[PDB]
Write a protein that binds this ligand. Structure first.
Ligand SMILES: *[C@@H]1O[C@H](CO)[C@@H](O[C@@H]2O[C@H](CO)[C@@H](O)[C@H](O)[C@H]2NC(C)=O)[C@H](O)[C@H]1NC(C)=O
Lengths: 49, 49
């Protein structure tokens, strides 16, 4: 449904466990190539993988 | 080096241990979006992940 508006840009605001799950599902569906953008809205940006 | 001639279609002739490593590295570098074609050149096609 995010591809309906052709969203090239998503800001993620989740906890230290949900960020890893969303990034793993994005990697599974393949939406991390050059052409998109992401912002991990937390203080521990290096805490995730 | 495979992006020099803009190679789109790659045949993987590897055993059941190296195919999973090549697929994991493709997913890590992000080259499994729509536009590329791959052939798992073996007999146990459903053996890999
Ligand atoms: C990566 O971040 C930049 C912002 O620093 C995004 O915008 C680019 O900004 C540079 C300026 O340093 C321009 O020269 C580029 O033309 C801009 N990109 C575009 C597409 O216009 C850039 O979009 C980001 N990358 C992605 C894939 O979103």
């Amino acid at each position: 449904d995010l591809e309906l508006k052709k969203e090239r840009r998503v800001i993620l605001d989740c906890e230290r466990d949900k960020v890893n799950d969303i990034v793993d599902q994005v990697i599974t569906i393949g939406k991390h190539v050059k052409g998109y953008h992401y912002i991990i809205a937390n203080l521990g940006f290096t805490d995730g993988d």
